[PDB]
UniProtKB/Swiss-Prot annotation, chain B:
Protein name in UniProt: NADH-ubiquinone oxidoreductase chain 4
GO CC terms, sorted: mitochondrial inner membrane; respiratory chain complex I
Gene expressing this chain: MT-ND4
Assembly, per entry: Core subunit of respiratory chain NADH dehydrogenase (Complex I) which is composed of 45 different subunits.
Organism: Sus scrofa (Pig)
Membrane topology value: Multi-pass membrane protein
Keywords: Electron transport, Membrane, Mitochondrion, Mitochondrion inner membrane, NAD, Respiratory chain, Translocase, Transmembrane, Transmembrane helix, Transport, Ubiquinone
Known EC number: 7.1.1.2
InterPro entries (alphabetical): NADH4_N (IPR000260), NADH_Q_OxRdtase_chainM/4 (IPR010227), NADH_UbQ_OxRdtase (IPR003918), ND/Mrp_TM (IPR001750)
Keyword Transmembrane helix among UniProt keywords: yes
Family recorded in the similarity comment: Belongs to the complex I subunit 4 family.
Length: 57, 459
């Protein structure tokens, strides 16, 4: 009493019901380097201008 | 500060936009006016320099040189409107443009508060002078002359550029006050000598010391009259100003490394003045005399003694005014005879009696005859040098003895003696030449009453 599967039926993505837990880190990833701290605080005018040699501004 | 600068640069549009023939007039008017305003800057306080802003400041050393440069500015215009009369108006305007652009830079560098700012226009004076020597110079070897003058200073200036920026990366700012207050004892590490050499050689070159001086005879002789005065009366003196300013952070390394220059300068002045004793060219003779007087200042500045700085500033100005005058003497004689050989036109006093006088105080002033400012310079330097070492007076006094012989040597060969028979184009001296000559001598004796004005910050 079987039935011939129709076209596309075998290619259907199916939900499989399992009991095994999902792997935590399947790639066995190590700890991640901490990103460098971001910029913060309001922009303030450059102190004493360009500060390049004799240029005052 | 600004009250001198904008009047100087705003003078430039005037000459360009003035009438066809009034260029000499209006330029002379306000150049003298600028001199008056500069004289208002001559005042100084006790110890703190006259500071104006981060960009400009003046002290008891800068002020006498500032008023000298502005005072000079009318004189080239007066001295040049004879060999440039037969020139297109644009070239005359361009010639005037070069002078005031040159003079503008001089006010900038002397009043500069930052060493790099002092440095940028330190060589920027070269470009106008290079044009003056090359284009309007009246000779053939002026081309090689300009090359010698240009390359010598650059060969010395570029080490200063590397040295100066090194100070900035190591000791923060290079503001003249901030260097003086935060001065540190320069070590004896073998790098610090090359540190010392770079910070000094730049001012050495454009302050002709024996060996590094061959550009000056080629600089002065082929240069036109205006070029010769500016080059000999102020240009040889940027090097002087630098040393008084830059030797703040060269101690105690200056104490030990001074020896090769001191021997070179002290011996060089005897050699150079000896050249003056047997120079065939009048302009060259005056040029070599500048080396001798300037080499005296080399010993003066490099001893690093309160008295030595004071006599330096005395010879700083007095030689410049005198050398400009003697170049005027040679120029005022040259076009009449159209030659530079001294023996070409002998016995000029019998023909031109007033020029006999003008040549006479001119020679006496260069003689360091007391109480002329030149004597105050040399005599002060001798005492400072003598305290440094007793032997140097043998070299010191010998220079004065040689300086006597060659100074009157031009007087006897040209002014006194028998007039030359063949020449017949010697006309009575134009009162322009006469007026200019008094424009030089009169402030010199006027300065004799007040040495304290030009003694300097050490005073
Ligand atoms: C026509 C030739 C030149 C004419 C004469 C000019 C003056 C002679 C000496 C020229 C010196 C130029 C280079 C100096 C730049 C500034 C020097 C300075 O600030 O001092 C440094 C001195 O250090 C140097 O090495 C400076 C250069 C020494 C000389 C060698 C190169 C210059 C000479 C050859 C090139 C120029 C000559 C012409 C070549 C065609 C300090 O650094 P340091 O070595 O103490 O640094 C910390 C640590 O020790 C390691 O760095």
């Amino acid at each position: 009493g079987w039935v011939r599967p129709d076209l596309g039926e075998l290619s259907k993505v199916t939900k499989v019901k399992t009991d095994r837990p999902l792997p935590e880190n399947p790639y066995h990833s190590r700890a991640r380097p901490e990103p460098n701290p971001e910029a913060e605080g309001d922009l303030k005018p450059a102190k004493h201008g360009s500060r390049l040699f004799f240029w005052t501004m | 500060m600004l009250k001198i600068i904008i009047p100087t640069t705003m003078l430039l549009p005037m000459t360009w936009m003035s009438k066809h023939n009034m260029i000499w007039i209006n330029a002379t008017v306000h150049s003298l006016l600028i001199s008056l305003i500069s004289l208002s800057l001559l005042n100084q306080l006790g110890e703190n320099s006259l500071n104006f802003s981060l960009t400009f400041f003046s002290d008891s050393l800068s002020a006498p040189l500032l008023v000298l440069t502005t005072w000079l500015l009318p004189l080239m215009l007066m001295a040049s409107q004879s060999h440039l009369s037969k020139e297109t108006t644009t070239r005359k305007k361009l010639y005037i443009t070069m002078l005031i652009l040159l003079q503008l830079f001089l006010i900038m560098t002397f009043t500069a508060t930052e060493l790099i700012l002092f440095y940028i226009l330190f060589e920027a004076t070269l470009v106008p002078t290079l044009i003056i020597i090359t284009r309007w110079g009246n000779q053939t070897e002026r081309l090689n002359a300009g090359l010698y003058f240009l390359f010598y200073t650059l060969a010395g200036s570029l080490p200063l550029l590397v040295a100066l920026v090194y100070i900035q990366n190591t000791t923060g700012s290079l503001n003249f006050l901030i260097i003086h207050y935060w001065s540190h004892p320069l070590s004896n590490s073998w790098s610090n000598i090359f540190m010392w050499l770079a910070c000094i050689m730049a001012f050495m070159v454009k302050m002709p010391l024996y060996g590094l001086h061959l550009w000056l005879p080629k600089a002065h002789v082929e240069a036109p009259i205006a070029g010769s005065m500016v080059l000999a009366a102020v240009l040889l003196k940027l090097g002087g100003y630098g040393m008084m300013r830059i030797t703040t952070i060269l101690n105690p390394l200056t104490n030990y490394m001074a020896y090769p220059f001191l021997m070179l300068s002290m011996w060089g002045m005897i050699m150079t003045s000896s050249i003056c004793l047997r120079q065939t060219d009048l302009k060259s003779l005056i040029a070599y005399s500048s080396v001798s007087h300037m080499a005296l200042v080399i010993v003066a500045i490099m001893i690093q003694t309160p008295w030595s700085f004071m006599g330096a500033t005395a010879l700083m100005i007095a030689h410049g005014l005198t050398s400009s005058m003697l170049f005027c003497l040679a120029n005022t004689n040259y076009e009449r005879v159209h030659s530079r050989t001294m023996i070409l036109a002998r016995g000029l006093q019998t023909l031109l009696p007033l020029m006999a006088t003008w040549w006479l105080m001119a020679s006496l002033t260069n003689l360091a005859l007391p109480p002329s400012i030149n004597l105050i310079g040399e005599l002060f330097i001798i005492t400072a040098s003598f305290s440094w070492s007793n032997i140097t007076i043998i070299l010191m006094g010998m220079n004065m003895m040689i300086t006597a012989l060659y100074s009157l040597y031009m007087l006897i060969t040209t002014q006194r003696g028998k007039y030359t028979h063949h020449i017949n184009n010697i006309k009575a001296s134009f009162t322009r030449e006469n007026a200019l000559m008094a424009l030089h001598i009169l402030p010199l004796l006027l300065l004799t009453l007040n040495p304290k004005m030009i003694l300097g910050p050490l005073y």
